[PDB]
Amino acid sequence: EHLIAQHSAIKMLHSRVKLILEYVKASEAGEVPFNHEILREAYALCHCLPVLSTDKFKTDFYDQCNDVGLMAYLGTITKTCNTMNQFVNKFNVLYDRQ
Amino acid sequence: FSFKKLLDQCENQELEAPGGIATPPVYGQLLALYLLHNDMNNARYLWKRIPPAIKSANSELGGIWSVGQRIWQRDFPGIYTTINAHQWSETVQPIMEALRDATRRRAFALVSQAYTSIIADDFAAFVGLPVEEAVKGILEQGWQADSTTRMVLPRKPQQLARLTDYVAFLEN
Amino acid sequence: SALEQFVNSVRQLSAQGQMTQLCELINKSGELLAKNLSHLDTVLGALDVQEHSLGVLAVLFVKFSMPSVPDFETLFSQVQLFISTCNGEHIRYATDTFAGLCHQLTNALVERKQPLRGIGILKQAIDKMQMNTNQLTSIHADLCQLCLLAKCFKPALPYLDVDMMDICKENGAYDAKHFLCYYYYGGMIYTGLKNFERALYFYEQAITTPAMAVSHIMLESYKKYILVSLILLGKVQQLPKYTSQIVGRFIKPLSNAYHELAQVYSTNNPSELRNLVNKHSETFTRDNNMGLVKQCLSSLYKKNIQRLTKTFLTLSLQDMASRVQLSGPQEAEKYVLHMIEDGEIFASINQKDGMVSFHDNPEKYNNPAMLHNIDQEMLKCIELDERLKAMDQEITVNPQFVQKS
Amino acid sequence: KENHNRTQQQVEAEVTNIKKTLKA
Amino acid sequence: GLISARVDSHSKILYARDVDQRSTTFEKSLLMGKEFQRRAKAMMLRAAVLRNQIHVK
């Protein structure tokens, strides 16, 4: 569900970018009378990428990745603890020896 | 790489033997390889694994073991002196010098890390090269040395699927 | 002609079911006192691989065959060809006898001087008979013993790195001695390879076996466990709570020298440790624990040097040597150099002032390498949970369960 | 998710089958 | 542990060490996970040996 929610928005972004790209391609050769203003804005849009490719960002991103990884490791440990608790309970009620 | 396949070949050669004891040349080659990879525990265990009679029969095993003791005590300057004491067989003539180069690199690490200032004599003893390697430190590597004190100054030098796996494991 | 009828029945029973009758017939042995099987052996052995003759080999090895009926080479070649080329599935139906054969092979190899050539045979036998790659068999113990006696620890590494889950019954012939000696020999192999964490794990597993008597394997495991905990850690690790309460009151008084060795080790004084080592040198030499005691002696110095970093940012060579009692700046410098080389400590040496600086800022946990490390740990934990869930479902599907609940 | 649900339902079916045949 | 500090004996200065909460949290969690894995793999073997009713007589 979360990935489908992301998909719904990436589809819209892709549609807008594809429309802009088609307009640029059409205005290139002969299709639509090109506007200098729109072409310059498209050039600025292309120059806007990559978004925040600085080394400072690349450290905070891995900070976040490692924080979520530690949380995932702890959650996995908790889940395995619950599973081993259930297994120990069933082993004790089957192999009950006094 | 080819080193993995060569090690696999030595494993095959060691696996089967006419009586559990192989030819002295291949035993020496295996001991030299163990010394080369710094796997000294298996090296010494191979040395005691060799029967005493064949061990005393040939002095090449004695020289290889003396190199092994020299590298076991981490006596860096004496490693080169001992490795040059004896002459090795032709089939292992170029590779053993390569081993020396490996030890060279090892010493370099032990100078780049764990040493802020190192005496020039001790640095030369560790690397083995008498005086010329010091030059290689400044001109090529980029260090800064000074005279009249002999103080060398080393300088210290696909995911979304994984997260989906994590969430799938945790949710069930 | 009873032999003709017997061999005809053996041939017919193969690939025809009714394995119980065949197994009972092999169990009814001992009347084949004739030793004329040598000339008739090499007629059907090559034909139809080797789906039989395991029982005849077992009953050939044990009946007063001290020098393997002076045909050691021929019998060794026979078992080599048998194990190398085998079905693997049919013989799995009767593992017990197979294991016994392997045991006899061990007794035929460790005796005089040559336990090495048989390592590569039990190596194939282990994965030929065992259920899966993680299943404890009695042949694991023999392989570990052969690797220990032959001073060849590398071959046993793939069969020690995996964690045992479930043990083959071997038709009720799997004794606790096999388990204890397998774990003890694995611990000794790991101590030989300087893998002290896994060696401590193996020794602890050997110790915590339920028992009601005193075993020499258990006592040696206790001694070596104490030594390994003193080497890898700075103290004797506390044994797990789920140990037998009776075996833990008799073994401890027997191993009193090692306990007082730990007691004097905890005082961080190498001089007293050496004096007490010299005081019970006989006990360690008799138990062949020497070499581990010297490793404890060196680990005390290493631990003192490591503790020096918990207080100091920068210390003189003379001050360090006086504090940790190495009696010399050069010895202290060599010790610290070796410690940094092995990665056990973060420090640098400045020979201009003869000083050591500890840089206790190794990692910031902000790099993809730590991401990969946490990924590997998570994968191990996930596979552990999957194995636990599989075991839980297996125990639930068991008919005795639910009926008792 | 579908594999986990299928395994859970198969285990449930097996345990109730064993419970039914155990009530003799 | 009464004083969180480090002695520099070269210049004779008592500095104050600052524990990195992030790094110490990460290392403690990793050590706990390693201990958990070792304990669980020992418990599985103990369950295996108790299911087989293996003991020393």
Q: Which strand (E) or helix (H) includes residue B151?
A: strand B151-152
The number of beta carbons lying within 10 Å of the beta carbon of residue C75 is: 19
Interface of chain B toward chain A, CB-CB under 8 angstroms: 164, 166, 169-170
DSSP state of C50: T
Q: Which strand (E) or helix (H) includes residue B118?
A: strand B115-119
Burial class (CB in 10 A: 0-12, 13-18, 19+), B90: exposed
Touching chains D and E? (3+ Cβ pairs < 8 A): no
Q: Which of B65, B77, B151 is nearest to B110 (CA)?
A: B77
Contact E49, A97 (CB under 8 A): no
- Which of E29, E40, E43 has its CB closest to that of A73? E29
Q: Which strand (E) or helix (H) includes residue C254?
A: helix C247-254
Cα gap C150→C155, rounded to integer Å? 11
What pairs with residue C211 in β-bridges?
A: E56
Unique residue bearing structure tokens 């819209």: A12
Using DSSP bridges, classify how beta strands C347-350 and C355-358 pair: parallel, antiparallel or unpaired. antiparallel
Distances in Å between the Cα of C106 and the Cα atoms of C96, C155, C184 are 16, 16, 17
Q: Is A59 on the interface with C (CB under 8 A)?
A: yes
How far is C-alpha C341 from the geometric centre of its chain's CA atoms? Answer: 29
Distances in Å between the Cα of B109 and the Cα atoms of A29, B126, B146, C147, C345 are 61, 10, 21, 35, 15
Burial class (CB in 10 A: 0-12, 13-18, 19+), D6: exposed
Burial C183-206 (b: 16+ CB within 10 A, else e): bbbbbbbbbbbebbebbbbbbbbb
Radius of gyration over every alpha carbon of chain D, rounded to an integer in angstroms: 11
- Count the helices and strands in chain A (H runs, E runs): 3, 0
How many residues make up chain D in this entry?
A: 24
Residues 6+ positions from B152 with CB-CB distance below 8 Å: B111, B117, B118, B119, B120, B123, B134, B137, B143, B145
Distances in Å between the Cα of B102 and the Cα atoms of B73, B108, C92, C339 are 17, 10, 49, 21
Distances in Å between the Cα of C71 and the Cα atoms of C37, C74, C77, C98 are 13, 5, 10, 20
Amino acid in position B129: L
Distances in Å between the Cα of C380 and the Cα atoms of B68, C161, C374, C376, C385 are 37, 14, 10, 6, 9
| Resolution to one decimal, Å | 3.0
Q: Is D1 on the interface with B (CB under 8 A)?
A: yes
What was the structure determination method?
Answer: cryo-EM
* 3-class secondary structure, C362: coil
Chains that touch E (3 or more CB pairs under 8 A): A, C
The dihedrals phi and psi of A73, each to the nearest 5 degrees, come to -65, -45
DSSP state of C92: G
C-alpha distance across the termini of chain E, in Å: 49
Instruction: Count the alpha carbons within 13 Å of B9 in the hemisphere toward its beta carbon.
Output: 9
Q: How far is C133 from chain D (nearest CA, A)?
A: 24
Q: Which strand (E) or helix (H) includes residue E14?
A: strand E13-15
DSSP state of B157: -
How many residues make up chain C in this entry?
A: 405
Contact C318, C278 (CB under 8 A): no
Instruction: Count the alpha carbons within 13 Å of C150 in the hemisphere toward its beta carbon.
Output: 23
Q: Is the peptide bond before A50 cis (omega within 30 degrees of 0)?
A: yes
How far is C-alpha C226 from the geometric centre of its chain's CA atoms? Answer: 17
The CB-based long-range contact list for A8-11 (8 Å cut-off, 24+ gap) reads: none
Instruction: Count the alpha carbons within 13 Å of C321 in the hemisphere toward its beta carbon.
Output: 15
The sheet with strand E13-15 has its strands ordered as: B151-152, B115-119, C347-350, C355-358, C312-316, E6-8, E13-15
Cα gap C179→E53, rounded to integer Å? 12
Residues 6+ positions from B145 with CB-CB distance below 8 Å: B134, B137, B138, B151, B152, B153
- Count the helices and strands in chain D (H runs, E runs): 1, 0
Q: Is C393 on the interface with D (CB under 8 A)?
A: yes
Range 1-24 of D in CB contact (< 8 A) with C = 7, 11, 14-15, 18-19, 22
* 3-class secondary structure, C136: strand
Q: Write out the two tokens for C365.
A: 């946990």
Contact criterion met (CB < 8 Å) for E40 and A95: no
Domains of chain C, residue spans: 1-50, 51-174, 175-307, 308-362
Contact C264, C276 (CB under 8 A): yes
Task: Tell me the Ramachandran region of residue C210: left when phi exceeds 0, alpha when psi lies from -120 to 50, beta otherwise.
Answer: beta
How many residues make up chain B in this entry?
A: 172
Using DSSP bridges, classify how beta strands C355-358 and B115-119 pair: parallel, antiparallel or unpaired. unpaired
Q: Write out the two tokens for C127.
A: 């994965």
Cα gap C229→C187, rounded to integer Å? 12
Contact C347, C357 (CB under 8 A): yes
How far is C-alpha C153 from the geometric centre of its chain's CA atoms? Answer: 10
Cα gap C232→C228, rounded to integer Å? 6
For an interface test with B, give the residue of A78, A79, A81, A82 to mutate (most B CBs within 10 A).
Answer: A79
Chains that touch B (3 or more CB pairs under 8 A): A, C, D
Amino acid in position A89: N
Task: Tell me the Ramachandran region of residue C120: left when phi exceeds 0, alpha when psi lies from -120 to 50, beta otherwise.
Answer: alpha
Using DSSP bridges, classify how beta strands B115-119 and C312-316 pair: parallel, antiparallel or unpaired. unpaired
* Torsion sign over Cα C319, C320, C326, C332: negative
Cα gap E45→E36, rounded to integer Å? 14
Cα gap C254→C283, rounded to integer Å? 11
Cα gap E7→C323, rounded to integer Å? 14
Residues 6+ positions from A44 with CB-CB distance below 8 Å: none
Contact criterion met (CB < 8 Å) for D11 and C403: no
- Which of A62, A90, A96 has its CB closest to that of C366? A62
Contact B98, B31 (CB under 8 A): no
